[PDB]
Design a protein around this ligand. Structure first.
Ligand code: A1CKL
Length: 167
């Protein structure tokens, strides 16, 4: 039993809510919040800009040190950093950004990173300003992630569409 509230059950292990992931993080303080990152960990907009803003830019400062030491992530890859005031840890996961012309096939690899964590609060990877089909991303999530994932969808119309079309 955990502290997430008002989530709709999609499958055995995947739940979904129309909510601001930042506000969900502040309320639950999960062990892991997932960031929809890019390979440079430059947290400008979307989930990343929103999470980073909520940390008062501490996420960005930590991320810049990470990149200076390790270089960029791979598309489909991830790293574990601090969750700052939002969570114990932040799992920065790079899904493909279709508006950058990146390989849609790497979305499954991106979701595989979730399987290293028993429970996660996460956004829908590659959706929103990342430009992929969100119905497709949800199918990949449910078909790839085996651990317990609580998906927070910001856009109300998007949430309603995702629920109403889910197989
Ligand atoms: O769920 C959605 O609508 C799509 C989602 N976007 C956000 O979660 C989001 N975007 C902008 N400002 C925000 N402030 C608090 C949350 C938030 C998303 C998923 C994957 C990549 C990029 C974006």
């Amino acid at each position: 039993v955990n502290s997430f509230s008002g989530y709709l059950k999609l499958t055995d292990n995947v739940y979904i809510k129309n909510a601001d992931i930042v506000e969900e993080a502040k309320k639950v303080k999960p062990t892991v919040v997932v960031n929809a990152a890019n390979v440079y960990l430059k947290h400008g907009g979307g989930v990343a800009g929103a999470l980073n803003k909520a940390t008062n830019n501490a996420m960005q400062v930590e991320s810049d040190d990470y990149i200076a030491t390790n270089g960029p992530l791979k598309v489909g890859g991830s790293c574990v950093l601090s969750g700052h005031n939002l969570a114990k840890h932040c799992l920065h996961v790079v899904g493909p950004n279709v508006n950058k012309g990146e390989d849609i096939q790497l979305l499954k690899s991106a979701y595989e990173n979730f399987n290293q964590h028993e429970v996660l609060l996460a956004p829908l990877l590659s959706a929103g300003i990342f430009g992929a089909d969100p119905i497709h991303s949800l199918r990949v999530c449910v078909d790839t992630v085996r651990t317990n994932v609580y998906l927070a969808v910001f856009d109300k119309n998007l949430y309603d569409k995702l629920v109403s079309s889910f197989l």
